[PDB]
Design a protein around this ligand. Structure first.
Ligand code: DCT
Ligand code: MG
Ligand code: MG
Length: 324
DNA sequence: GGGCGCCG
DNA sequence: CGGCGCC
């Protein structure tokens, strides 16, 4: 029965291609949107020119409409049958360590399932191995109360080695969310500052410590600044493996760090992006005027997150507000 | 946007 | 050493 059936069908097929074969969210979005609106319409759609009228649809859609009208065809649309690589690839990407590039290669060699991975372990680099090892684990968000305990344990043991050590937990957590992807933690130490730019050792000790207590349980990397690894809560008879990140910022550049580690990522993007519009360039370490020629001037002093915002002419926004 | 570590 | 995956 349904008049515009035929069309809406196409339309929807179309959006999902746009959705997957691309990023083309904007496209896909109008796409469905439209199919939706033509769909609510109570008259048979005859002319694409009629369609246009209806809100949601426009030129580009109306065209696609036409080509369908005369002939069920849609050469573009016919093209579609290319399929399957794309489904599987992305999937693989869900694997921590697996980027689009290693995902491709993995698919080309026929590895393109979860099951398959497990079978082709030998092809995986270490990180991948882990992502793979703790796969199901990595898909669960940490709940507030958990982080809590973790905040605790980190907090504590940090003190034991030195109580001069400062540890702040950023990212989601700090922005107040109810569930957090991982645990992100800023670490600082006054012995360490913009003048020395050394002491990998501080971080170093600390991971070993947590390590030596069965907290961290794996290691994805260990720089003289960064640190990503797995960790886990304890119990009697167990808690899911979590992703952990430590970053050591020279005690003197704590604020740039804090801002940056709090995110959100989008926020940072907009913000950093903005500093520029204003003439300064911001990194986890500093905010320094950015010179006429296009080179970084000396770094403006910072005494609190507020000041960063003051510089780019922006209203301070609480962490909980830095969503974007 | 701006940058850290590891791959091979 | 680039480039990758990640933050
Ligand atoms: N591409 C990125 C990623 C992060 N940052 C910052 C934002 C905070 C931290 C990223 O931590 P994530 O754990 O990626 O984000 P989150 O806020 O912790 O989110 P989740 O809930 O997923 O852990 O690095 C940035 O400037 N650019
Ligand atoms: Mg987080
Ligand atoms: Mg993280």
């Amino acid at each position: 029965e349904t008049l515009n059936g035929g069309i809406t069908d196409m339309l929807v097929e179309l959006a999902n291609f746009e959705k997957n074969v691309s990023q083309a969210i904007h496209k896909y979005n109008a796409y469905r949107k439209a199919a939706s609106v033509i769909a609510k319409y109570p008259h048979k759609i005859k002319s694409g020119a009629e369609a246009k009228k209806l809100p949601g649809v426009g030129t580009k859609i109306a065209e696609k409409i036409d080509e369908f009208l005369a002939t069920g065809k849609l050469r573009k649309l016919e093209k579609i049958r290319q399929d399957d690589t794309s489904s599987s690839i992305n999937f693989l990407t869900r694997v921590t360590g697996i980027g689009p590039s290693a995902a491709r290669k993995l698919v080309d060699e026929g590895i393109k399932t979860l099951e398959d991975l497990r079978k082709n372990e030998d092809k995986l680099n270490h990180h991948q191995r882990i992502g793979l090892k703790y796969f199901e684990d990595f898909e669960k968000r940490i709940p507030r109360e958990e982080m809590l305990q973790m905040q605790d344990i980190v907090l504590n043991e940090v003190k034991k080695l030195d109580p001069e050590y400062i540890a702040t937990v950023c990212g989601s957590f700090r922005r107040g969310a109810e569930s957090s992807g991982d645990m992100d933690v800023l670490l600082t130490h006054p012995n360490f500052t913009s003048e020395s730019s050394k002491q990998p050792k501080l971080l170093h000790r600390v991971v070993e410590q947590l390590q030596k207590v069965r907290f961290i349980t794996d290691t994805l990397s260990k720089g003289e600044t960064k640190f990503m690894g797995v960790c886990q809560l304890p119990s009697e008879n167990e808690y899911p493996h979590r992703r952990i990140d430590i970053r050591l910022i020279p005690k003197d550049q704590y604020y740039c760090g804090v801002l940056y580690f709090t995110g959100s990522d989008i926020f940072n993007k907009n913000m950093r992006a903005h500093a520029l519009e204003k003439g300064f360039t911001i990194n986890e370490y500093t905010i320094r005027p950015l010179g006429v020629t296009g080179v970084a001037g000396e770094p403006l002093p910072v005494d609190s997150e507020q000041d960063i915002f003051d510089y780019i002419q922006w209203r301070y926004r609480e962490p909980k507000d830095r969503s974007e």
